[PDB]
Amino acid sequence: SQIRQNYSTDVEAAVNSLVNLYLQASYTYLSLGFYFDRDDVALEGVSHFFRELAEEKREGYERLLKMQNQRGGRALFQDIKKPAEDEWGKTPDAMKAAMALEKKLNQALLDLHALGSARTDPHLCDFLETHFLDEEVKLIKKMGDHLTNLHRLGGPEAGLGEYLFERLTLKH
Amino acid sequence: SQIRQNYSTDVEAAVNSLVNLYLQASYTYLSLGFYFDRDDVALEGVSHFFRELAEEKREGYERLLKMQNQRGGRALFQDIKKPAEDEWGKTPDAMKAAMALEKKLNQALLDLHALGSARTDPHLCDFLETHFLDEEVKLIKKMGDHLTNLHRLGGPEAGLGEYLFERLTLKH
């Protein structure tokens, strides 16, 4: 590669691996998104919330593939694993799955930052910090707040709570 | 002081003391404000309500310091006492703490008015009446109304009530 400089084979492969993880998370969010528009679930605000996240994850993998080209790495694609569940249950369940998925992406991001730091690759480190890290922290905080409000709305009165949350917090 | 006229040493010191009280109330409101944005509390409308009050209290101390300069008093600063609690509980609790804090400021304002009246200082009296007294009365009334609506929303159904109040009364 005529352009490749300070770009380790380890980062390259771990970037490809993070790309597969983003593709998979996107796929998960697509499934959550359509799930909540089923006639027998019908929570459009929740559907929208998840569709948006599918879309932000695709931007993630796209930005990771562009950066691969820019550093002169070579993208390598693997199969994308189907989402972990076929039905997602109620809003609090789905939001807890989404939380767990974002924590795993965040950990993979922190892991890739540590690797790049170890291979003294400050371009890769700051690319991750300016385009991925701050955004994860903001999104996880939002999901925590959502979970707190779903819980304050739970207990016996749960169906009503789910309706109110979708109507008064989520965007439709 | 070349400008000082009809400005008693007692008013001067009591103004400095009221400044410390406003600084402390601001500090309290800052703490309430961030408290309600914790991921495990997550009531943005309540957070905003308290952040706004932190800000109005700062204007209070600023207006009191300007008036000190204008009369030719000398400001004297003391340490600012940390807020009285580290956790503020639920919306009704916090609103009751806020009520109690505004009553204490109002009493200190009325006390300073009586002192200025006693020292025949009509500039100070009307400064307090045009910039502080009317505003306290309006704010305490609002807090009373909030407390009435939180109570009408309380009982067994309390979590839901707190959610509705934050969503349908408070500004976000």
Add this chain to the structure above:
Amino acid sequence: SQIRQNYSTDVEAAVNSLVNLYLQASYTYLSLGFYFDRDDVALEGVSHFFRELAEEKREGYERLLKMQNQRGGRALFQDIKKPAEDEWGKTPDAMKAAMALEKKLNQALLDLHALGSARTDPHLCDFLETHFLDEEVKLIKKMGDHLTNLHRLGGPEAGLGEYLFERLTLKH
């Protein structure tokens, strides 16, 4: 905490401690600000300079408290220490106190960066670098330039120099 990830207890406490330092610096700037509007000092441009800095420091503590919530730390408030002097002397003196105060904040910022670097927390490191470090360096440079111009205006002709500096350099 449902959201807390890669956020050490040490950073958390040192953030709370940096918050107290910003609150205190704000307080110092408030005192400088009113001091320079005393009828017997009367340097409005210097007053304005310090009032602005009080305001930028408050933004600092506010941004630090928001980041605490976002990472899922818990804010803890302590008393705020009164400013170190009651009278600030002439413009060069005050500007030298302000310089010394900014160096201490900068050192505390660098100290917190080193700690976060030691605990491999790149979110915290870059938060500090993008919102605090560059701004300190710019502000200290400005204060150095001010001190150089106050000195070039000093010597026997000092009163006149102070007047000219306030009128021709500072904003009013």
Add this chain to the structure above:
Amino acid sequence: SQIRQNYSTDVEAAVNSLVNLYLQASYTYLSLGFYFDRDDVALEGVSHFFRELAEEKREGYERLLKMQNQRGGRALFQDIKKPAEDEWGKTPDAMKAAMALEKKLNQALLDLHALGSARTDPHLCDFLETHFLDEEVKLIKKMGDHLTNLHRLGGPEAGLGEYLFERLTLKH
């Protein structure tokens, strides 16, 4: 008088007396104003400063005469005493005369407030507080600040200082 209510003969006469004092202060400011435009003094910014004050004093006496009509008092005019000096010296001297004149008006205002308070006439008290008291305090503060800056510009270098003050502080 068909309209007169709660309006004591004492207030009435003291209002007429305060009118004479405002007429006299206006007259003083007229004299200061033209003095500073003499070819051999030639400080246009100082001239303007005093002309403006002549004008604000006339508004004072006009507002006092209107209030006399409104309460159903009867205006009584006396001769207006010529200003106390024919030459006003240098800017600091004139500004000190102006300071002394504003303190005497302020004392007469406070005296009339006390009298109205003694005769339980709250209309007269608040008329004075909303249209006269706050304005005196602001003006005396400004004059103090001017005197501080003239002094910081004084000593051996006095002619230059006077020039700079007129050019860089006063409006022209």
